[PDB]
Amino acid sequence: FASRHGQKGTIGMTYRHEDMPFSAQGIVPDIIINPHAIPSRMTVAHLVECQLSKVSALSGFEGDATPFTDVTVEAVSKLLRSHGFQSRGFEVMYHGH
Amino acid sequence: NTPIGRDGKLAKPRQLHNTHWGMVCPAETPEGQACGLVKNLSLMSYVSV
Amino acid sequence: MIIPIRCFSCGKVIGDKWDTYLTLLQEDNTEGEALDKLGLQRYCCRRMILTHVDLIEKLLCYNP
Amino acid sequence: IVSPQSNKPVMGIVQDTLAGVRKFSLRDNFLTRNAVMNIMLWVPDWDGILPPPVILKPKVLWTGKQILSLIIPKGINLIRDDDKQSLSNPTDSGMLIENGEIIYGVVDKKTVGASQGGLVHTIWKEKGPEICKGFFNGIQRVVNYWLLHNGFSIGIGDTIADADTMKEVTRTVKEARRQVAECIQDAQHNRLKPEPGMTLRESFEAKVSRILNQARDNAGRSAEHSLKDSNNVKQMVAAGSKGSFINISQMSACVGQQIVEGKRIPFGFKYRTLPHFPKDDDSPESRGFIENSYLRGLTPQEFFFHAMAGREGLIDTAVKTAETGYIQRRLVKAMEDVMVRYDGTVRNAMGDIIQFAYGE
Amino acid sequence: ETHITIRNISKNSVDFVLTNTSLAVANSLRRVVLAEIPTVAIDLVEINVNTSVMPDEFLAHRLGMIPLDSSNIDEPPPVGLEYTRNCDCDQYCPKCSVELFLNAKCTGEGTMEIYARDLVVSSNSSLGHPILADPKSRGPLICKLRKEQEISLRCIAKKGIAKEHAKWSPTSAVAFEYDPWNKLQHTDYWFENDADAEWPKSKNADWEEPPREGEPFNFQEEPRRFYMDVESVGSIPPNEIMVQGLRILQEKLAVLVRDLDEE
Amino acid sequence: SESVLLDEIFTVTSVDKQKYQRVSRITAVSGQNDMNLTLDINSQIYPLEKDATFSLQITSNLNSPDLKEAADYIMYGKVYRVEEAKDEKVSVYVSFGGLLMAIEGSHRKLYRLSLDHVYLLLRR
Amino acid sequence: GGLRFGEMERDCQISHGCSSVLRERLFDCSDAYRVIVCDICGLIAIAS
Amino acid sequence: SGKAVAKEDRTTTPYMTKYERARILGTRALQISMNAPVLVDLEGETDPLQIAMKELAQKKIPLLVRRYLPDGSYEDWSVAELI
Amino acid sequence: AEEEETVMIAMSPEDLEASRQMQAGYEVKEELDPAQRVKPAPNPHVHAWTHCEIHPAMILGILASIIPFPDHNQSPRNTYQSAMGKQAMGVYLTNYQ
């Protein structure tokens, strides 16, 4: 599997629902990639997309991702706590074990 | 394509030329071998009948 | 093809919650926000009815 | 685990188990008596004896170094002595182990990666593979287990430099425009000058790619020097696990200027970089050179410049994929011949001797 | 003493609060409820004719997840069937597996829309009957048809736990949050410019302290008070799940004792 | 075998508290200006402020009861490295797996040197 | 089958020094073939 | 054109080589695997090689090594001799 | 392609408006903009333009125009996804059946 940013990935394991970090809302990740596939492959778009996808949370406003627009990180962030979450994507997480 | 081909095969044309901007052809070629030998028509590209 | 039924992350049934969904975003002048009126507090699965493609009306018309 | 190519190790702790070591070899990380226990079930060859606690005060606590130094053999010494280091600590700086127990500084790539006098190197080589072979099993098992319940990750926030301290970034960038202004126009009055290596047009190109390159470092160096030490991606780097100073500066500060065959974005067509520019626009505001990072981030008139610089190391990676192989076979096909004869000498197929030692 | 302090309830979820208990037990209850809680679900279809658009393979997987009534379950013989694996009968028998039917045809020319309603159990008031999450509807959607596209399916349900396939757990998710401020600092919040300023207080945050001081922070303190919130699918009433949670969690501790005091 | 090795009062003049959550290195200075001491110590459980006063002890045992009860902070770590500079005098650097020690005073005290770990004891 | 044992590949046994692995993965695990040679003019015989 | 060398005036290294160990253990393996006279109290093994290794440790294994020199001469070494 | 040489295109209308205001001296207002694509301001000489580009986002592959936030990656990553995208999976034609 790979996203739309050239994060060629392969499945390594299949954890059942309990094991996975059920947190805290509390949902469970459908898949989870590793943080070392970021800084070196500089692919800050993968990030942005995820902060924005989220924001089609309590909105459903299909969030446009148009190549060159005024839309900024600092912009979407404000739109975040706007729904009660962290203006930066993050969240606290509870271990499955 | 880009016949050719059998006349290198080091750089030229492969490399991206300023000229491409527009009918770009952005960055969407095969991984290695035939890099930048294949290209795709932009969204606005119009070819001369 | 047709709603997934049962969201991908939780279990929250979504087979029931579409014949009724579509009858708001195009039939009640309420927002994408209107689904909130269907018990969709989590992300989560609620991106299920939302990110969905009705691929059967446009497939069903091939009659043998 | 140690090729003679370099008489240095070729495998070492890397990726998550490595990022983990740092974030756990810190003397900020204590272990609750609650486990400890749990994590003691990897070693995998356990004394059976539970390590004597380092803290007997109100709660009983174990330092992260303690239980780590457990999975290192008994009786290997190291005096790493990094840069600045004093009779003091002074601040977890350096590294030093004794009877198979650390006591000093912090574990990172510096020591559990294929380093020269590397810890991996040092038990190999005393006392041969295994418990040597177990070393990778212990740390790569203990730590993974620690990390499982320590959690670690990165989001955008880890990429967005301080708002105040970002004003000062954009200041030292636009403050290097003036340093080109005093070059684009001052070398139209023949007051360069040039030399050596030539030429005059080139020794101009030089005094710019120099200012643009150095001017960037300042923006990036400040962007990092203003990021909490505990900022994901910055710690992922300190560890060594993945990525580097130039990865952070490009993500949160600027990016350009990008190159190509040893010369900033080339002209052609005509006397101009592109059709959104005058002519003779020997300025960065056009010729390959971005001011923003993958956050704002890139501007059209820029986006392309970047993609076409990208497609160079994108074919230069298409070569090393084949050529590198061609040159390999050359050597082999002329050295298969040689080998060390039981006499203590290396000789040809035909017996024609090429060395009188085993390698001098 | 107490142990639980419920707030709101509904028909699909049960918000409440644990009191005098430990972290372990909390989680170990979260888990229990999400996995090993016997339920009915369909786990075998035989197709006769199907000229619809959903393939047979695609129906099985879909007809599966559709919830069914379970209620009591762990109370044989009737009003509850024991796993079809360890049954006193052979192969498959109604004494340990409930039969379901689906004979959908077409009498129209416009378009058909077959829901969970059209199925047919047997009349053994098990149950049994699926569910109708929808408000005065007919149940979760199954498949669409045009002209003559009748399908004929034989479905029989067995007994199973999430572990065996996510199909069974009658439980959506769970929403716990022990220590909502940051007493025990079981977490290092990422700043980015000012700590207690970026992270949102939680609705469940208004039930505690310890702001002010600088005590300094305690440590003899263990995590107690857990704000859970169980939500069911609609397969079996909203706990139910919880109630039946410990019943097969105590009995999981027992297994142990008995395998150590007998010998 | 009562082998006490420290019975002197110290005081705090500086505390960091340098981008570490827990742990904090403190400074002593007592007696005739020529004492000074410095160590890392969990600032989560047992914080210390200026003019903290109150002595400390070390030893290596073990059996006593009062000493065990007294104080509200106890540690345990080898010494490894005890050199001498600037008018004889001894300086000892003991490590408690990460958390580090430093003292500057001549023979008496000296019953130390021995590296056989230490057990540090703090009473307020 | 089968797989493929490149020139590249073989040059690596030689580095380690495995006469026997090498011989095994080229003259046994692929073409195990035996023939009978005349001692004067080394050629295929009328063997049975 | 061989020449043979004096079991009394041996030149080469008294120690057993990285490669030899590998060849000997390889050789006895096949031998024992071929039902052969095992020369040390059978510890209770199964693996025709893991057994040969039991032998090597006790230097109670037959086989000798002829080390051809460039000259064309050779030397014979006994497993019990080697190191 | 050969007609470009003799032409002078603009990037965004905003740039054209700024140039028109300068032709008579008009404030720039650079102390009001927030996190965004820092353009090259103001405008080097160039008294009047000739054409202006429709939108810089039509300068894209057919398969690369599907990638969130294209202008934001490291470039090399951009080249990917497109070539791999073709290897994606999904419905290719309403009438595959």
Curated annotation (Swiss-Prot), chain B:
Other comment: The binding of ribonucleoside triphosphate to the RNA polymerase II transcribing complex probably involves a two-step mechanism. The initial binding seems to occur at the entry (E) site and involves a magnesium ion coordinated by three conserved aspartate residues of the two largest RNA Pol II subunits.
Subcellular locations according to the entry: Nucleus
Protein name as annotated: DNA-directed RNA polymerase II subunit RPB2
Family of this protein: Belongs to the RNA polymerase beta chain family.
Organism this protein belongs to: Schizosaccharomyces pombe (strain 972 / ATCC 24843) (Fission yeast)
Assembly behavior: Component of the RNA polymerase II (Pol II) complex consisting of 12 subunits.
Functional summary from the UniProt entry: DNA-dependent RNA polymerase catalyzes the transcription of DNA into RNA using the four ribonucleoside triphosphates as substrates. Second largest component of RNA polymerase II which synthesizes mRNA precursors and many functional non-coding RNAs. Proposed to contribute to the polymerase catalytic activity and forms the polymerase active center together with the largest subunit. Pol II is the central component of the basal RNA polymerase II transcription machinery. It is composed of mobile elements that move relative to each other.
Curated annotation (Swiss-Prot), chain C:
SUPFAM superfamilies per the UniProt record, alphabetical: RNA polymerase subunit RPB10 (SSF46924)
Localization, UniProt: Nucleus
InterPro entries attached to this UniProt entry: RNA_pol_su_RPB10 (IPR023580), RNA_pol_suN_Zn-BS (IPR020789), RPABC5/Rpb10 (IPR000268)
Pfam family, one: RNA_pol_N
Keyword Transcription regulation listed: no
GO biological process entries: transcription by RNA polymerase I; transcription by RNA polymerase II; transcription by RNA polymerase III; transcription elongation by RNA polymerase I; transcription initiation at RNA polymerase II promoter; tRNA transcription by RNA polymerase III
Sequence positions that bind Zn(2+): C7, C10, C44, C45
Keyword terms of this UniProt record: DNA-directed RNA polymerase, Metal-binding, Nucleus, Transcription, Zinc
An MF annotation (GO) of this entry: DNA binding
Spans through the membrane: none
Primary localisation category: nucleus
Listed PROSITE patterns: RNA_POL_N_8KD
GO CC terms in record: cytosol; nucleolus; nucleus; RNA polymerase I complex; RNA polymerase II, core complex; RNA polymerase II, holoenzyme; RNA polymerase III complex
UniProt subunit comment: Component of the RNA polymerase I (Pol I), RNA polymerase II (Pol II) and RNA polymerase III (Pol III) complexes consisting of 14, 12 and 17 subunits, respectively.
Assigned protein family: Belongs to the archaeal Rpo10/eukaryotic RPB10 RNA polymerase subunit family.
Record protein name field: DNA-directed RNA polymerases I, II, and III subunit RPABC5
Organism: Schizosaccharomyces pombe (strain 972 / ATCC 24843) (Fission yeast)
Encoding gene, per UniProt annotation: rpb10
From Swiss-Prot, chain F:
Gene: rpb8
Function, as annotated: DNA-dependent RNA polymerase catalyzes the transcription of DNA into RNA using the four ribonucleoside triphosphates as substrates. Common component of RNA polymerases I, II and III which synthesize ribosomal RNA precursors, mRNA precursors and many functional non-coding RNAs, and small RNAs, such as 5S rRNA and tRNAs, respectively.
Annotated segments matching region Non-specific ssDNA binding: 16-38
Binding partners and assembly: Component of the RNA polymerase I (Pol I), RNA polymerase II (Pol II) and RNA polymerase III (Pol III) complexes consisting of 14, 12 and 17 subunits, respectively. Directly interacts with POLR2A.
Molecular function per GO: DNA binding; DNA-directed RNA polymerase activity
Annotated compartments: Nucleus
Record InterPro entries: NA-bd_OB-fold, RPABC3
Family in the record: Belongs to the eukaryotic RPB8 RNA polymerase subunit family.
GO cellular component: cytosol; nucleus; RNA polymerase I complex; RNA polymerase II, core complex; RNA polymerase II, holoenzyme; RNA polymerase III complex
Any one GO BP annotation for this protein: transcription by RNA polymerase III
Stated name of the protein: DNA-directed RNA polymerases I, II, and III subunit RPABC3
Keywords per UniProt: DNA-binding, DNA-directed RNA polymerase, Nucleus, Transcription
Curated annotation (Swiss-Prot), chain H:
Any GO CC annotation of this UniProt entry: nucleus
Record keyword Nucleus present: yes
Keywords: DNA-directed RNA polymerase, Nucleus, Phosphoprotein, Transcription
Molecular function terms from GO: DNA binding; DNA-directed RNA polymerase activity
Record PTM: Phosphorylated.
Keyword rRNA processing part of the UniProt annotation: no
Subcellular location: Nucleus
Gene Ontology biological process terms from the UniProt entry: DNA-templated transcription elongation; transcription by RNA polymerase I; transcription by RNA polymerase II; transcription elongation by RNA polymerase I; tRNA transcription by RNA polymerase III
Entry's family note: Belongs to the archaeal Rpo6/eukaryotic RPB6 RNA polymerase subunit family.
Function: DNA-dependent RNA polymerases catalyze the transcription of DNA into RNA using the four ribonucleoside triphosphates as substrates. Common component of RNA polymerases I, II and III which synthesize ribosomal RNA precursors, mRNA precursors and many functional non-coding RNAs, and small RNAs, such as 5S rRNA and tRNAs, respectively. Pol II is the central component of the basal RNA polymerase II transcription machinery. Pols are composed of mobile elements that move relative to each other.
Subunit structure: Component of the RNA polymerase I (Pol I), RNA polymerase II (Pol II) and RNA polymerase III (Pol III) complexes consisting of at least 14, 12 and 17 subunits, respectively.
Protein's recorded name: DNA-directed RNA polymerases I, II, and III subunit RPABC2
